[PDB]
Amino acid sequence: GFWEEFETLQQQECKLLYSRKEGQRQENKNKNRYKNILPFDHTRVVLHDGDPNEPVSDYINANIIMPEFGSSGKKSYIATQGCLQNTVNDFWRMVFQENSRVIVMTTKEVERGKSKCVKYWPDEYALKEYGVMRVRNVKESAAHDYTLRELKLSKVGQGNTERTVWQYHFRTWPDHGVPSDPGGVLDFLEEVHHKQESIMDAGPVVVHSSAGIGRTGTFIVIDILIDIIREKGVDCDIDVPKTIQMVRSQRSGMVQTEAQYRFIYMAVQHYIETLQR
């Protein structure tokens, strides 16, 4: 039962209470959108190469999520919150350092009067410097449910560091609850998957939401489960609770609501039914 399964998961959280001390440091307080939502220390993305005048330059509210313990970076994700005004530069340091080539944005910049992500990309055709990083917005391609932005990211002053980063911005997720059917998300995730698959040396896919746990966990868990079906077929074992437990061992609270939990099952079933057609 969906209701019983999600409740059992919500109770099991007491054994994934790993340290979150770095995000609790005074220097990092203003780098978190939400005081209570912090990365586990052992899976957090540690930022190197920071300004040597900054006493703490190694922190972003983000964790690596591996679907399996041996996963390559190309098969992994970074779950993170939407940028704050003061973390846009750190976000691009993270994207560059981790060799990420695909970003999945699951919110608008603002929903119901609240900032869910400060704009971290230039206007179409424009060039912006974000700290030491330079970003050109080469082209935007607008679909029904999402916009794709082809971004070119490089380190200022250093040639031959340029790489293309593809930002898939899902724009129609409802302000409350979840989409009433998963077709839009499934089509979006299919494009994300093929783009990531096509890039030889790609690092983890960056996925973000206001806190980096609810919509972020929903998209990541759907993506993991559909990839199992890609490899193993429509009759394979699918274990939604165990997959949620795996991602929750790497960032607290992934998948926040019962509607999200039901949406994951619905997305997987629709993926299966399109294949069977």
């Binding site: 209570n36 206001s210 746990i213 609810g214 609501t257």
Partner: peptide, 6 residues
């Protein structure tokens, strides 16, 4: 910073 309870 605030509190995410969704």
């Amino acid at each position: 910073p605030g509190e995410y309870v969704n």
